[PDB]
């Protein structure tokens, strides 16, 4: 269910502008957590959080030509499983 439809609306070789569908009314959460990292070695992932009323986020500082995986988490598990996409800058 929540959230869904994780697109990459815009992209430069060093940053990605992502978006998602928050649902409506009774499904809007207080915050989302976004984590991004290389699809392979990762070392550690980089993460940040955005308030629940927003549905976009910018990922900056990426290394060009590297395939990154981007995941979007709800506050709890009782919402509808995480979302995850892959994207090479």
């Amino acid at each position: 269910s929540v959230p869904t439809k994780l697109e990459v609306v815009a992209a430069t070789p060093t940053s990605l502008l992502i978006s998602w569908d928050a649902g409506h009314w009774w499904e809007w959460v207080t915050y989302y957590r976004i984590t991004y990292g290389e699809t392979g070695g990762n070392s550690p992932v980089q993460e940040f959080t955005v308030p629940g009323y927003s549905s976009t986020a910018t990922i900056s500082g990426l290394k060009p030509g590297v395939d990154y995986t981007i995941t979007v988490y709800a506050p709890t598990s009782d919402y509808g499983s995480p979302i995850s996409i892959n994207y090479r800058t």
Binding site: W25, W26, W28, V29, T30, Y53, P75, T76
Partner: peptide, 10 residues
């Protein structure tokens, strides 16, 4: 609200 997690009820 849940664990103060649903926006509108919270």
């Amino acid at each position: 609200s849940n664990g103060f997690t649903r926006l509108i009820p919270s």
